[PDB]
Design an enzyme around this catalytic site. Structure first.
Site, PDB file in Angstrom:
ATOM      1  N   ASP A   1       0.864  -1.182   0.000  1.00 17.12           N
ATOM      2  CA  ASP A   1       0.000   0.000   0.000  1.00 17.12           C
ATOM      3  C   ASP A   1       0.902   1.234   0.000  1.00 17.12           C
ATOM      4  O   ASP A   1       1.407   1.627   1.054  1.00 17.12           O
ATOM      5  CB  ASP A   1      -0.931   0.000   1.200  1.00 17.12           C
ATOM      6  CG  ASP A   1      -2.106   0.943   1.025  1.00 17.12           C
ATOM      7  OD1 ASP A   1      -3.225   0.464   0.737  1.00 17.12           O
ATOM      8  OD2 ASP A   1      -1.912   2.165   1.168  1.00 17.12           O
TER       9      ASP A   1
ATOM     10  N   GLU B   1       2.178   5.124  -0.134  1.00 11.72           N
ATOM     11  CA  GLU B   1       1.801   6.517   0.034  1.00 11.72           C
ATOM     12  C   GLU B   1       2.655   7.340  -0.918  1.00 11.72           C
ATOM     13  O   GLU B   1       3.798   6.979  -1.207  1.00 11.72           O
ATOM     14  CB  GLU B   1       1.981   7.003   1.475  1.00 11.72           C
ATOM     15  CG  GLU B   1       1.216   6.191   2.509  1.00 11.72           C
ATOM     16  CD  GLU B   1      -0.282   6.158   2.264  1.00 11.72           C
ATOM     17  OE1 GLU B   1      -0.835   7.121   1.687  1.00 11.72           O
ATOM     18  OE2 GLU B   1      -0.915   5.157   2.657  1.00 11.72           O
TER      19      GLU B   1
ATOM     20  N   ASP C   1      -2.222   1.201  -7.002  1.00 15.82           N
ATOM     21  CA  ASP C   1      -0.810   1.108  -6.641  1.00 15.82           C
ATOM     22  C   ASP C   1       0.021   0.506  -7.764  1.00 15.82           C
ATOM     23  O   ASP C   1       1.061   1.055  -8.140  1.00 15.82           O
ATOM     24  CB  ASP C   1      -0.663   0.288  -5.364  1.00 15.82           C
ATOM     25  CG  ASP C   1      -1.448   0.878  -4.219  1.00 15.82           C
ATOM     26  OD1 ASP C   1      -0.829   1.482  -3.321  1.00 15.82           O
ATOM     27  OD2 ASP C   1      -2.695   0.784  -4.247  1.00 15.82           O
TER      28      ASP C   1
ATOM     29  N   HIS D   1      -4.185   5.993   5.964  1.00 13.64           N
ATOM     30  CA  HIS D   1      -3.236   6.629   5.051  1.00 13.64           C
ATOM     31  C   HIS D   1      -1.795   6.541   5.538  1.00 13.64           C
ATOM     32  O   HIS D   1      -0.918   7.235   4.999  1.00 13.64           O
ATOM     33  CB  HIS D   1      -3.603   8.091   4.770  1.00 13.64           C
ATOM     34  CG  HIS D   1      -5.034   8.281   4.378  1.00 13.64           C
ATOM     35  ND1 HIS D   1      -5.515   7.938   3.133  1.00 13.64           N
ATOM     36  CD2 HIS D   1      -6.093   8.761   5.072  1.00 13.64           C
ATOM     37  CE1 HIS D   1      -6.806   8.207   3.074  1.00 13.64           C
ATOM     38  NE2 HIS D   1      -7.182   8.707   4.237  1.00 13.64           N
TER      39      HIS D   1
ATOM     40  N   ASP E   1      -2.071   0.682   6.701  1.00  9.84           N
ATOM     41  CA  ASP E   1      -3.012   0.194   5.701  1.00  9.84           C
ATOM     42  C   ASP E   1      -2.734  -1.267   5.368  1.00  9.84           C
ATOM     43  O   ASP E   1      -3.665  -2.068   5.216  1.00  9.84           O
ATOM     44  CB  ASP E   1      -2.941   1.066   4.445  1.00  9.84           C
ATOM     45  CG  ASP E   1      -3.631   2.412   4.626  1.00  9.84           C
ATOM     46  OD1 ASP E   1      -4.356   2.589   5.630  1.00  9.84           O
ATOM     47  OD2 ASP E   1      -3.445   3.298   3.762  1.00  9.84           O
TER      48      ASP E   1
HETATM   49  N1  LIG Z   1      -7.781  12.357  -0.072  1.00 11.42           N
HETATM   50  C1  LIG Z   1      -6.696  11.823  -0.632  1.00 11.42           C
HETATM   51  C2  LIG Z   1      -6.438  10.411  -0.519  1.00 11.42           C
HETATM   52  C3  LIG Z   1      -5.330   9.946  -1.107  1.00 11.42           C
HETATM   53  N2  LIG Z   1      -4.472  10.792  -1.790  1.00 11.42           N
HETATM   54  C4  LIG Z   1      -3.230  10.302  -2.457  1.00 11.42           C
HETATM   55  O1  LIG Z   1      -3.295   8.932  -2.800  1.00 11.42           O
HETATM   56  C5  LIG Z   1      -2.297   8.182  -2.067  1.00 11.42           C
HETATM   57  C6  LIG Z   1      -2.836   6.800  -1.720  1.00 11.42           C
HETATM   58  O2  LIG Z   1      -4.006   6.867  -0.903  1.00 11.42           O
HETATM   59  P1  LIG Z   1      -4.165   6.038   0.469  1.00 11.42           P
HETATM   60  O3  LIG Z   1      -3.441   6.756   1.571  1.00 11.42           O
HETATM   61  O4  LIG Z   1      -5.652   5.999   0.644  1.00 11.42           O
HETATM   62  O5  LIG Z   1      -3.539   4.710   0.218  1.00 11.42           O
HETATM   63  C7  LIG Z   1      -1.899   9.094  -0.909  1.00 11.42           C
HETATM   64  O6  LIG Z   1      -0.576   8.841  -0.437  1.00 11.42           O
HETATM   65  C8  LIG Z   1      -2.032  10.482  -1.535  1.00 11.42           C
HETATM   66  O7  LIG Z   1      -0.885  10.741  -2.339  1.00 11.42           O
HETATM   67  C9  LIG Z   1      -4.745  12.145  -1.882  1.00 11.42           C
HETATM   68  O8  LIG Z   1      -3.959  12.848  -2.495  1.00 11.42           O
HETATM   69  N3  LIG Z   1      -5.863  12.596  -1.289  1.00 11.42           N
HETATM   70 MG   LIG Z   2      -2.381   3.913   1.897  1.00 14.37          MG
END
Ligand SMILES: Nc1ccn([C@@H]2O[C@H](COP(=O)(O)O)[C@@H](O)[C@H]2O)c(=O)n1
Ligand SMILES: [Mg+2]
Length: 200
Positions: free
Chosen positions: A15, A17, A114, A172, A177
């Site tokens: 996962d 970031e 991803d 996040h 995650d």
């Molecule tokens: N509200 C959000 C959710 C995710 N993201 C982007 O997508 C990436 C992956 O999302 P997750 O943290 O949900 O895995 C984050 O690290 C961020 O760069 C974002 O920019 N705004």
């Molecule tokens: Mg994540």
């Protein structure tokens, strides 16, 4: 049949970031690279790869990015860039024994983003070849939809809600995650689900 035989010796939970902003930064760059290696039968965590990654195109994390992920600038300063981290992954895979053709493993992600979008897109930007084990994966949302018969609305949060599981750690956070994905997988296996590759 609780915890049936599975088609893989190991599952690799990943996962990312990435750098971000509002409106969205461009291009995005991976800043956290976690992999949880799960026992293929029990879904128990047996090994962890985890590195923060130094972004190069936009090297300073935005306030939004740090607020969203909890990753502060000092966690990415002085880190290797994606090219080196991908070389560290390959070494980690080798030491784990996952490069044996007779050891079957597959990546598991929450969504397709991803490995369908983020990693190939940055690798193409950098002119880096994508290792072949990154090219097949299981989208947990799709797997959950076959196991439970329904489409979760908001990713890990709603899948934990459907399975009456408490959320592990911080949303996040890449590593946190991954632990939720592993916990969801363990419960789906308890219910008798056999995981299958979903990527095309
Ligand atoms: N509200 C959000 C959710 C995710 N993201 C982007 O997508 C990436 C992956 O999302 P997750 O943290 O949900 O895995 C984050 O690290 C961020 O760069 C974002 O920019 N705004
Ligand atoms: Mg994540």
């Amino acid at each position: 049949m609780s915890f049936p035989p599975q088609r893989y010796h190991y599952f690799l939970v990943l996962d990312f970031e990435a750098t971000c902003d509002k409106p969205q930064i461009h291009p995005q760059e991976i800043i956290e690279f976690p992999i949880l290696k799960l026992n293929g039968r029990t879904m128990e965590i047996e090994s962890t790869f985890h590195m923060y990654v130094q972004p190069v195109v936009h090297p300073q994390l935005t306030p939004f990015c740090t607020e969203l992920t909890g990753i502060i600038q000092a966690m990415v300063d002085g880190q290797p860039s994606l090219q080196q981290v991908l070389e560290r992954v390959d070494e980690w895979m080798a030491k784990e024994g996952l490069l044996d053709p007779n050891v079957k493993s597959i990546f598991v992600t929450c969504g397709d983003w991803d490995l369908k979008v983020m990693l190939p897109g940055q690798c193409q930007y950098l002119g880096l070849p994508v290792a072949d084990y990154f090219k097949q994966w299981i989208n947990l949302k799709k797997a959950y939809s076959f196991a439970m018969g329904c489409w979760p609305k908001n990713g890990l949060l709603d899948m934990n809600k459907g399975l009456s599981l408490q959320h592990i750690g911080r949303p996040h956070s890449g590593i946190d995650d991954c632990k939720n994905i592993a916990n969801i997988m363990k419960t789906l296996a308890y219910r008798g689900f056999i995981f299958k590759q979903t990527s095309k």
